[PDB]
């Protein structure tokens, strides 16, 4: 209730509001950078999907196992989340959706395994428990694919033995600068759609490959999977910045409201103190 306490509080809140506004501007600037990077490999994955469409077009008799579903079992969830806090509810919303969908398989009792990329993800998965076969941290704003090749490589190596059934990828979708959605998808099986390009006007002669097209797609397929997971993780990274701007702007507004209320209380206390001092002085001067 001391006047100096209120003064210190208002000064501290002013400084904090200024630095939070500066951080909001910083986050706004960082927002676009990743948007641009996405637009860079977006054609890549787009032309890559055009490639994979050509890849599936090849070896018409041969069939790869990636296009079938074994008895649904051994579900594997890959989680990408922030390494730092203050991302709004994005982390908690994604994790809540993760655990709720985990009940799904848990409902028909499908064994659940998970891999993580985020630091908050590793903290949450350690607090919950279980055993994690792949954990990474400190990936970076623009991580090289090698930084993440190990997790997907070991996961695919594990699936190559047939132990796993399929991997259920998790990440966030950035709709606009103010709207994100925690999204869960499936990646291991692939089905072409609207890829009729080069099909209505395909060359009459058969595309004969000097290299063996029997295995040429294999590396491209693994190339396809690493490209898509890199695109997903970079999209999540870009979306992560989009939450911080609104978080800090809301924090600044709340700080403004609080400082207004504190100013009201401060004025009331100051007037009361002045009145009390004047009354005491007059009363004492009457005594003498």
């Amino acid at each position: 209730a001391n006047l100096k306490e209120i003064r210190a509080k208002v000064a501290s809140i002013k400084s904090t509001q200024k630095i939070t506004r500066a951080m909001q501007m910083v986050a706004a600037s960082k927002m676009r950078r990743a948007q641009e990077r996405m637009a860079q490999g977006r054609p890549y994955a787009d032309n890559m999907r055009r490639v994979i469409a050509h890849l599936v077009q090849a070896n018409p008799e041969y069939k790869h196992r990636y296009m079938v579903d074994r008895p649904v079992k051994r579900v594997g969830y890959i989680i990408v989340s922030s390494d730092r806090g203050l991302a709004g509810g994005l982390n908690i919303n994604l994790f809540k959706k993760v655990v709720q969908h985990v009940k799904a398989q848990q409902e028909q009792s499908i064994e659940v395994q998970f891999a993580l990329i985020g630091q908050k993800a590793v903290s949450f998965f350690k607090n919950y428990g279980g055993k994690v076969l792949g954990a990474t941290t400190q990936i970076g704003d623009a991580p090289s694919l090698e930084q993440l090749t190990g997790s997907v490589q070991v996961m695919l190596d594990a699936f190559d033995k047939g132990e796993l059934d399929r991997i259920y990828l998790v990440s966030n979708g950035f709709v606009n600068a103010m709207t994100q959605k925690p999204k869960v998808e499936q990646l291991v099986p692939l089905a072409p759609a609207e890829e009729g390009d080069d099909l209505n006007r395909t060359y009459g002669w058969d595309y004969i490959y000097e290299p063996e097209a029997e295995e040429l797609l294999n590396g491209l397929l693994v190339r396809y999977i690493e490209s898509m997971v890199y695109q997903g993780v970079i999209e999540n990274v870009a979306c992560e910045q989009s939450a911080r701007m609104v978080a800090m702007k809301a924090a600044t507004d709340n700080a403004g409201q609080l400082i207004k209320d504190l100013q009201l209380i401060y004025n009331k206390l100051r007037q009361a103190a002045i009145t009390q001092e004047i009354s005491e002085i007059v009363g004492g001067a009457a005594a003498v």
């Binding site: 209730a1 306490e5 209120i6 210190a8 509080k9 501290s12 809140i13 400084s15 904090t16 630095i19 939070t20 951080m23 910083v26 032309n47 490639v51 730092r84 806090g85 203050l86 400190q138 970076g140 704003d141 623009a142 090289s144 040429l216 590396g219 491209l220 190339r223 924090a251 609080l258 504190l262 209380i265």
Partner: protein, 66 residues
């Protein structure tokens, strides 16, 4: 891999640099170190701003106004 035709010439660049000759990655290594330094600096700023100031003012606000 690569697809080449008079229409288009395309190459999947898993690992590749426009550096003139083989064994020229020193600049690439320098840029990687610079990016890591930027990551360290941004983590420093994030930790400082997000935790120190907010905890200082919240714990200050934790002390009741009146």
């Amino acid at each position: 891999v690569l697809e080449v035709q008079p229409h288009v010439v395309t190459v999947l660049a898993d690992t590749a640099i426009r550096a003139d000759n083989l064994d020229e990655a020193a600049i690439l290594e320098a840029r990687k170190n610079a990016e890591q330094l930027l990551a360290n600096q941004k983590s420093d700023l994030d930790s400082a701003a997000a935790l120190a100031a907010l905890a200082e003012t919240a714990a200050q606000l934790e002390t009741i106004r009146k």
